[PDB]
Amino acid sequence: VSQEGLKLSNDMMGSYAEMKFDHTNSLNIAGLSLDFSSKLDNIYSSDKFYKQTVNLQLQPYSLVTTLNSDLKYNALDLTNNGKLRLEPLKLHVAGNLKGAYQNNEIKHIYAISSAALSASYKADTVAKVQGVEFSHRLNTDIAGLASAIDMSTNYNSDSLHFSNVFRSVMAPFTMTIDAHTNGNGKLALWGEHTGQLYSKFLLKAEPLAFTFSHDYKGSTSHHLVSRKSISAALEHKVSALLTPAEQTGTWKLKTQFNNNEYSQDLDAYNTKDKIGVELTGRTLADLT
Amino acid sequence: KLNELSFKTFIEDVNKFLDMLIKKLKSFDYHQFVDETNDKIREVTQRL
Amino acid sequence: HSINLPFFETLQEYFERNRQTIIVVLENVQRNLKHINIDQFVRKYRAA
Amino acid sequence: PEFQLPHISHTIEVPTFGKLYSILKIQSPLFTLDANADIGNGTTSANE
């Protein structure tokens, strides 16, 4: 203990057979600063051990913090990292996390920042288990006020490929929606089933003028045993115009089951001169 | 203003202003507004 | 169709009368103020 | 679509009714139905 500052250093060692412990501390005071370092090492076996690196640095108008740990067990691994830069009028957070075991490895990416009173976030998650990937992407530009969002999840498999793309902005006055989903099921359990997925939703919202377009294309064929080939086709489009000047909407439900097909042409109309709707039901039925 | 202030004229002016406000809101551009805000903040910064 | 009722024009003529009277009162006040220009107030203040 | 708003006057804007019809038609060789329901308001004169 001196007028310059406090110094503390504590080092505990321990070793026997296979489990060996190496622990040390570094604590000193320099005026208005702290230089912390605890190198904590727990070596139990070669592939079976643990590591911990805790290092803190204190200084005016800034912060330094390093946090890295290591963990293994024979065929199992788990690692992580972290960066913390907290500074006035800003923010800077990053690091890594990854967990792997033999064949299946999961990798994650994260980074958090803030500048000019605007948040910034980005996350990446990559999963690869038994050859089946999972690409789920989240984009940056995540601030909170008049920000944007964009999600991208990608699923690829030997029986199902899934892909959706979403993009929307929660602007105070205008509003947009972009939904685009595509899927394809390949099922062979008790007959073939083509789980084909077509999806598209769009929407544009603004004061005194609302509108939206949805189109759906659902066609699925079921080639079962004993020539039970079943074709399921469901196709509908959703559309309506919402504004005080005029109100209307159109909806075409188009479906068919093998030899039996139905269609309905549903349209809405609402204007200052006339209002009404139209019905048209076409049914094609077999048997007696 | 008082002489020109009439019920029909006042309601006509109100309808005109609401219509122009709705027209501006419908054609409200995000990037235009952001640049306008940047210009105004820069102007305030220079003034101060 | 333009449905019109006598209460509408009754209110309109009452409003017209009120606006005329208020314009008259405002003109009276303005003439009274212009009659005693700011110089008279300044001289009275200096005398006080 | 752009926004439309009729002007506001001191009068009352009430659009007169036109005519109302119910066109229904059924197409099937088992039975065909083409009934119709129609109705309107007398617009020959406002008083009538």
Short mmCIF file of all heavy atoms in Angstrom, two decimals, chain A residues 8 36 41 51-52 63 74 82 92 96 105 142 180 214 235-236 239 245 252-254 261:
data_model
loop_
_atom_site.label_atom_id
_atom_site.label_comp_id
_atom_site.label_asym_id
_atom_site.label_seq_id
_atom_site.Cartn_x
_atom_site.Cartn_y
_atom_site.Cartn_z
N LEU A 8 -2.04 -5.34 -5.49
CA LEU A 8 -2.42 -6.65 -5.00
C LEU A 8 -2.11 -7.69 -6.07
O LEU A 8 -2.51 -7.53 -7.23
CB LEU A 8 -3.91 -6.71 -4.64
CG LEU A 8 -4.37 -8.11 -4.22
CD1 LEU A 8 -3.62 -8.57 -2.99
CD2 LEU A 8 -5.87 -8.12 -3.98
N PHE A 36 -6.62 -4.94 -14.02
CA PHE A 36 -7.01 -6.24 -13.49
C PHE A 36 -6.66 -7.34 -14.48
O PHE A 36 -6.81 -7.17 -15.69
CB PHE A 36 -8.51 -6.27 -13.18
CG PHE A 36 -8.98 -7.62 -12.73
CD1 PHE A 36 -8.75 -8.05 -11.43
CD2 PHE A 36 -9.64 -8.47 -13.60
CE1 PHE A 36 -9.18 -9.29 -11.01
CE2 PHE A 36 -10.07 -9.71 -13.19
CZ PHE A 36 -9.85 -10.12 -11.89
N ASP A 41 -6.73 -20.96 -14.74
CA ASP A 41 -6.48 -22.12 -15.59
C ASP A 41 -6.71 -23.39 -14.78
O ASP A 41 -6.04 -23.61 -13.76
CB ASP A 41 -5.06 -22.08 -16.15
CG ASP A 41 -4.80 -20.83 -16.97
OD1 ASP A 41 -5.75 -20.32 -17.60
OD2 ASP A 41 -3.65 -20.35 -16.97
N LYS A 51 -10.59 -23.23 -19.24
CA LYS A 51 -9.82 -22.00 -19.24
C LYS A 51 -10.74 -20.81 -19.00
O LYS A 51 -11.91 -20.81 -19.38
CB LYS A 51 -9.07 -21.82 -20.56
CG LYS A 51 -8.05 -22.90 -20.84
CD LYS A 51 -7.25 -22.57 -22.08
CE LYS A 51 -6.68 -21.16 -22.00
NZ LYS A 51 -5.91 -20.94 -20.75
N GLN A 52 -10.18 -19.77 -18.37
CA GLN A 52 -10.94 -18.55 -18.09
C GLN A 52 -9.95 -17.39 -18.08
O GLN A 52 -8.98 -17.40 -17.31
CB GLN A 52 -11.70 -18.65 -16.78
CG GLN A 52 -12.53 -17.42 -16.47
CD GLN A 52 -13.69 -17.26 -17.43
OE1 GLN A 52 -14.30 -18.25 -17.85
NE2 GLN A 52 -14.00 -16.03 -17.79
N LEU A 63 -13.70 2.06 -21.36
CA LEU A 63 -13.75 0.80 -20.61
C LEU A 63 -13.12 -0.29 -21.47
O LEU A 63 -13.44 -0.40 -22.66
CB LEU A 63 -15.18 0.43 -20.24
CG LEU A 63 -15.30 -0.93 -19.55
CD1 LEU A 63 -14.42 -0.99 -18.31
CD2 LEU A 63 -16.75 -1.24 -19.20
N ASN A 74 -12.97 -34.29 -24.56
CA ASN A 74 -12.78 -35.38 -25.51
C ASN A 74 -13.39 -35.06 -26.86
O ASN A 74 -12.78 -34.36 -27.68
CB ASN A 74 -13.38 -36.68 -24.95
CG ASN A 74 -12.73 -37.10 -23.65
OD1 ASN A 74 -11.76 -37.86 -23.65
ND2 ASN A 74 -13.26 -36.62 -22.54
N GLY A 82 -16.06 -12.49 -25.93
CA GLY A 82 -16.85 -11.30 -25.69
C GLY A 82 -16.03 -10.03 -25.66
O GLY A 82 -15.00 -9.95 -24.98
N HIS A 92 -20.27 -0.40 -28.06
CA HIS A 92 -19.58 -1.33 -28.95
C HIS A 92 -19.45 -2.67 -28.24
O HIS A 92 -18.58 -2.83 -27.38
CB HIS A 92 -18.21 -0.79 -29.36
CG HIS A 92 -18.24 0.62 -29.85
ND1 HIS A 92 -18.47 0.94 -31.17
CD2 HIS A 92 -18.09 1.80 -29.20
CE1 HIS A 92 -18.45 2.26 -31.31
NE2 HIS A 92 -18.22 2.80 -30.13
N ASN A 96 -17.78 -13.84 -29.71
CA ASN A 96 -18.10 -15.05 -30.44
C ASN A 96 -18.64 -16.10 -29.49
O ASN A 96 -18.25 -16.14 -28.32
CB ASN A 96 -16.89 -15.60 -31.20
CG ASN A 96 -17.21 -16.88 -31.94
OD1 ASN A 96 -18.36 -17.16 -32.25
ND2 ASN A 96 -16.18 -17.68 -32.20
N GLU A 105 -21.62 -29.02 -35.83
CA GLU A 105 -21.03 -27.78 -35.35
C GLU A 105 -22.05 -26.66 -35.49
O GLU A 105 -22.69 -26.53 -36.54
CB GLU A 105 -19.76 -27.42 -36.13
CG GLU A 105 -19.16 -26.09 -35.74
CD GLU A 105 -17.96 -25.71 -36.58
OE1 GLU A 105 -17.60 -26.49 -37.48
OE2 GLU A 105 -17.39 -24.62 -36.35
N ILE A 142 -30.89 -2.10 -36.99
CA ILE A 142 -31.85 -2.31 -35.92
C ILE A 142 -31.60 -1.22 -34.89
O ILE A 142 -30.76 -1.39 -33.99
CB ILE A 142 -31.73 -3.71 -35.31
CG1 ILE A 142 -32.04 -4.78 -36.36
CG2 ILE A 142 -32.68 -3.86 -34.13
CD1 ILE A 142 -31.76 -6.19 -35.90
N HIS A 180 -42.26 -13.36 -48.89
CA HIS A 180 -41.97 -14.23 -50.03
C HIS A 180 -41.49 -15.57 -49.49
O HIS A 180 -40.33 -15.71 -49.12
CB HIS A 180 -40.92 -13.60 -50.95
CG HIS A 180 -41.25 -12.21 -51.38
ND1 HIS A 180 -41.13 -11.12 -50.54
CD2 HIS A 180 -41.70 -11.73 -52.56
CE1 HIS A 180 -41.49 -10.03 -51.19
NE2 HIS A 180 -41.84 -10.37 -52.41
N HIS A 214 -52.14 -10.29 -51.70
CA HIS A 214 -51.74 -11.64 -51.33
C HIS A 214 -52.03 -12.57 -52.49
O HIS A 214 -53.13 -12.57 -53.03
CB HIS A 214 -52.46 -12.13 -50.08
CG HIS A 214 -52.25 -13.59 -49.83
ND1 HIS A 214 -51.05 -14.10 -49.38
CD2 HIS A 214 -53.07 -14.65 -50.00
CE1 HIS A 214 -51.15 -15.41 -49.26
NE2 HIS A 214 -52.36 -15.77 -49.63
N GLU A 235 -55.52 -22.47 -55.21
CA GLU A 235 -54.92 -21.23 -55.69
C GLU A 235 -55.88 -20.08 -55.41
O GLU A 235 -57.00 -20.06 -55.93
CB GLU A 235 -54.61 -21.32 -57.19
CG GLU A 235 -53.55 -22.35 -57.55
CD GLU A 235 -54.07 -23.78 -57.52
OE1 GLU A 235 -55.30 -23.97 -57.49
OE2 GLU A 235 -53.24 -24.71 -57.50
N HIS A 236 -55.44 -19.14 -54.58
CA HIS A 236 -56.26 -17.98 -54.24
C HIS A 236 -55.40 -16.73 -54.24
O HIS A 236 -54.21 -16.79 -53.91
CB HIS A 236 -56.92 -18.16 -52.88
CG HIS A 236 -57.81 -17.01 -52.50
ND1 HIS A 236 -58.86 -16.60 -53.28
CD2 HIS A 236 -57.78 -16.18 -51.43
CE1 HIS A 236 -59.46 -15.57 -52.71
NE2 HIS A 236 -58.82 -15.29 -51.59
N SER A 239 -56.94 -9.44 -52.61
CA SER A 239 -56.67 -8.08 -53.05
C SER A 239 -57.87 -7.21 -52.71
O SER A 239 -59.02 -7.60 -52.98
CB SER A 239 -56.39 -8.03 -54.55
OG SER A 239 -55.24 -8.80 -54.87
N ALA A 245 -61.91 7.42 -50.91
CA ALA A 245 -62.43 7.72 -52.24
C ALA A 245 -63.23 6.55 -52.80
O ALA A 245 -64.30 6.73 -53.38
CB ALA A 245 -61.28 8.08 -53.18
N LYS A 252 -60.22 -14.51 -55.75
CA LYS A 252 -60.50 -15.61 -56.68
C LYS A 252 -60.03 -16.91 -56.04
O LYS A 252 -58.86 -17.28 -56.11
CB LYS A 252 -59.81 -15.37 -58.02
CG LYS A 252 -60.15 -14.02 -58.63
CD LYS A 252 -61.65 -13.83 -58.71
CE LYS A 252 -62.00 -12.47 -59.25
NZ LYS A 252 -63.47 -12.26 -59.30
N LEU A 253 -60.96 -17.61 -55.40
CA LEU A 253 -60.67 -18.89 -54.77
C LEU A 253 -60.78 -19.97 -55.84
O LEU A 253 -61.88 -20.34 -56.26
CB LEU A 253 -61.63 -19.17 -53.62
CG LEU A 253 -61.43 -20.53 -52.96
CD1 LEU A 253 -60.01 -20.64 -52.44
CD2 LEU A 253 -62.43 -20.74 -51.83
N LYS A 254 -59.63 -20.49 -56.27
CA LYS A 254 -59.57 -21.50 -57.32
C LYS A 254 -58.99 -22.77 -56.73
O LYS A 254 -57.83 -22.80 -56.32
CB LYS A 254 -58.75 -21.00 -58.51
CG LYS A 254 -59.21 -19.64 -59.01
CD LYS A 254 -60.70 -19.65 -59.27
CE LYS A 254 -61.22 -18.27 -59.63
NZ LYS A 254 -62.69 -18.27 -59.84
N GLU A 261 -63.54 -29.84 -59.55
CA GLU A 261 -62.99 -28.49 -59.49
C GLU A 261 -64.09 -27.51 -59.13
O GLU A 261 -65.22 -27.62 -59.62
CB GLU A 261 -62.37 -28.10 -60.83
CG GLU A 261 -61.81 -26.69 -60.86
CD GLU A 261 -61.27 -26.30 -62.22
OE1 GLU A 261 -61.34 -27.14 -63.14
OE2 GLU A 261 -60.79 -25.16 -62.36
#
